[PDB]
């Protein structure tokens, strides 16, 4: 499949993004439990108590049993509101997080994908370089069988041949481990991916750094949270201060209670005291409570809440310094990426001709084998460097998008285009 | 000492593994505090209170003093149990952790040990390459003193000589800092370690990836915790639900209370009210409590508990995707490791011969010094690469063991064998 | 500006160090809230309750309203003290942290600064090496226009020229991103910084490792906290044990309460019961409470507190093994740094001569272009390696100071001296 398909297969199964989802869901569901306390609280009670006096109470025993139905209602309790508010701001922050986590699934899938591609290039270029050092090998031998070149010419091309093999060895191990990477992110294994279409490839000067910086300054998901979080630090200052406000609660209830006495001092005296009482009651009331002074606590708290607010602020600064540095760097790099794709595109030609000469010359005694084998090594580097440069350019784009905090499923389509030629991921 | 000894000296002192032990110990000891609440709670109270009426109560004062001995016992409180259970599942997870931390002391000690070894190799091979570029140096000089070679031949071998020195310099600094590494992990310094016995060295094709994967899928300590932890998430769902259940506690007590009145309204009225009371009481009772409705709280909690359960699940998927990627990579690498040890074992020969030629040729004006100094550099790389490949093979074995979650003191013995020749760790 | 100025401009704005400050401030301000509970707790209450009997209580209703002014005072409550103490020890640890965070602003600013310097060197040395491969290029062309050199001589110098360009490209991108680094730490952009004065440069053998180790063993901020934190672990053991001690609190209050009855059974009976009661009361008292047995809880806790104390101990060991490894490494590195500055200072000469030969020879057909272009590449490496070695030496000094835990604004001045020549940070 291609980038845009491999992505979607992951967006519906990546355990990391889902875990992040479930974390946002809990965060919001919690807003309920937060408001919960502002609502009616109904409970049922019932007791049974056997008493037994033993001094002036001697000879007096009793069996009472009650069962009330109590209800509570907050009339004015600032902290109970504060809490609800804060749980909401928290869910909000958790959301900005989930979004950030969504962007990461993109950058990481795209990167993982172009690693399996660059992995393939390295292998192919290593097989081309091997096949070359082989022709050159086979040839120094013929030229040596007619005494037109020392034995060293054959011993040299053999040595550099064995060496390329040790590489082709690992270059193939990497294409493998690069697919295990993709597998883990997307959850799948791919027989083939759509390779970068080198003909239709074109770089594109990036927006001026200034425009980039200014949108990121208003969209970068990281900066956004430092903002939300600073707000939350302020909201908490208020919370601390509520410790000074008074509260008004309402209570209501209806209960029955049946008591029965027994014992010495019960048999006689009468006085209608020890008669079995069977009470019934209905109640409603208001409770006002106001802190007057609590050992300095409420202020020590309000101060702390403010220092923590300063901290939240310093972190906002950091977030911003970071969103800046990330933007300028991403700008610099994408440019240097385009600039490098050119230099190497070039070097791959100057090295191709030079190799063609050395080879041609070697065949008529004008060029040394060392010159050939070195021209060969030079070409197959410029070749990989160029291949590599292209992938970094593609990624650097995604980086700027992410630094702006606007990296999405679309940016992943714009790239799904420069892809085309279906190549195998298996090193057969 | 050797690997198997250096390990044991660390297993009894590594501050990280011990810190992890103490963490498992606390975790289990806590299971007590968790059950604690399900047992009898006995306390002693005693008060003294001076009252002083001031309205209809004016002229009525009192001095009362009490002292009860209370006891509480949970009869049916689901959450109290739930708690115990959860504290147990927690200790369990903490155990799986400790085990994981035990494996790491192995892998890290073995690795730290083979780094001091590979560090030694780099130093030796750098000293051999220096001693070579010296002979070749001393020689281009004699050949130059008989005008058989330009001055450049001596200036070239000198330059490349100074360069090897700049290396031998750092290669020796690394053998040092490589020993500081081992020191930190084992707590000791070693004058010498058992070096890899290159003659008896043999690679061993690893188990099919499929078998590997399947055992890891049932032993990998990481995958194990994702399982334990997912269970815990479920256990917590139940816990949330317990908020709906009612509870039944039993209370018992025996207390005395002596009150004495005094004042205006006390001098006369009598009525046997203001007579000094000296009460005695014994009580036992049951208390039933049942939530009827708590502002939606209990469900908002049960929902949250479930979302968190989803998260626990997604992480189990991550654990698994990881155990897979780790097994398959470890398999790939160990193979590539064996495959590489061969290629380099080979290249060390093809490069040995080619160097012997260049040298032989240079001595009879047939080969250039550049050709000699380059053949020299080529040999002493293939030599190190091979040396290095062997160590990685050894480690890659330990890795697969770790991915399976069965890496133990034995696997550290199997390797203690390919060791032998006691080499110094000091670069004299 | 120079290092010592760039530093001060950051020390008054670095959002990370400020955030750390605010964290230490809260930590100390909290010591109040910790002591808070040991002081008088004054509150105001007032209720209103309408009762309505409905069985034996039928026909009896009431309207009562109260309003007390309560005060509480801890007489002897160990845990309330313990808490204050612990909050103090915590602020203490938070302080050692802030200090550590202060050192880091130094090391990081110095490093960010010397990276912008080494970044400049790499660019300059790459421009010198480019200007060289250009002269040599232009020359092989003239030598080629007189059939005195094959076409390959011009094709070779061209290829290696394009290659240096691909580098000069990135070396300039790095000087940029190296300035973004400084910007983020200091908050500023610098047109120019004081470059290392290469003439007045001299290395200085570091104190013996033993003296270094012994001071660090008594000043290293990291080892210090492991100590503070181990103490705190002990303090928490005591805290656990306080769960066995009894507590003595004092209460005091003055409240009024006005009750008024009404209803069927109220109209008549009289008996002076249903008359409106208007009570007044003043109270003071002592409350003694002593745990007798709490399901094993208090011990399960004291045990845990001890296992955690073992952990705190193991970590102290880790801290120490680390302070050791850090000192020894810094010692080793600064030495190897001095030793390396020498080897490269040397190699820059042996490579300078050899290049001068090759060039001289090439001009009279005695030396090959490949020999020239390689002597050129060899020189402009030893040159950078030397430049680089110097910077590492400077840093390694700062590292040892830090390992001792005495790195300060002064050490940043001693270095501000080896600086001088104002160089631009812009790659014009
Ligand atoms: Cl207060
Ligand atoms: Cl509910
Ligand atoms: Cl106990
Ligand atoms: Na694979």
Coordinates of N, CA and C and ligand atoms in Angstrom, one line a residue, chain A residues 173 175-180 189 425-427, chain B residues 209 328-329 331-332, ligand 4:
Chain A
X173 N 19.8 -6.1 6.6 CA 19.3 -6.4 8.0 C 18.5 -5.1 8.4
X175 N 16.8 -3.0 6.3 CA 15.6 -3.0 5.6 C 14.6 -3.8 6.4
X176 N 15.1 -4.9 7.0 CA 14.2 -5.7 7.8 C 13.8 -5.0 9.1
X177 N 14.7 -4.7 9.9 CA 14.4 -4.0 11.1 C 13.6 -2.7 10.9
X178 N 13.6 -2.2 9.7 CA 12.9 -0.9 9.4 C 11.5 -1.3 9.1
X179 N 11.2 -2.5 8.7 CA 9.8 -3.0 8.5 C 9.2 -3.4 9.8
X180 N 10.0 -3.8 10.7 CA 9.5 -4.2 12.0 C 9.0 -2.9 12.7
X189 N 2.4 -5.6 8.3 CA 3.6 -5.9 7.6 C 3.3 -5.6 6.2
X425 N 9.4 -4.8 -0.1 CA 10.0 -4.5 1.2 C 10.9 -5.7 1.6
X426 N 10.7 -6.8 0.8 CA 11.5 -8.0 1.1 C 12.7 -8.1 0.2
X427 N 13.9 -8.3 0.9 CA 15.2 -8.4 0.2 C 15.5 -9.8 -0.3
Chain B
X209 N 12.3 -17.8 14.4 CA 11.7 -16.7 15.0 C 10.3 -17.0 15.6
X328 N 11.4 -10.3 17.0 CA 11.8 -10.3 15.6 C 13.1 -9.5 15.3
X329 N 13.3 -8.4 15.9 CA 14.5 -7.6 15.7 C 15.7 -8.4 16.3
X331 N 16.0 -11.4 16.6 CA 16.2 -12.6 15.8 C 17.0 -12.1 14.6
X332 N 16.5 -11.0 13.9 CA 17.2 -10.5 12.8 C 18.6 -10.1 13.1
Ligands
LIG4 NA1 11.3 -9.1 9.5

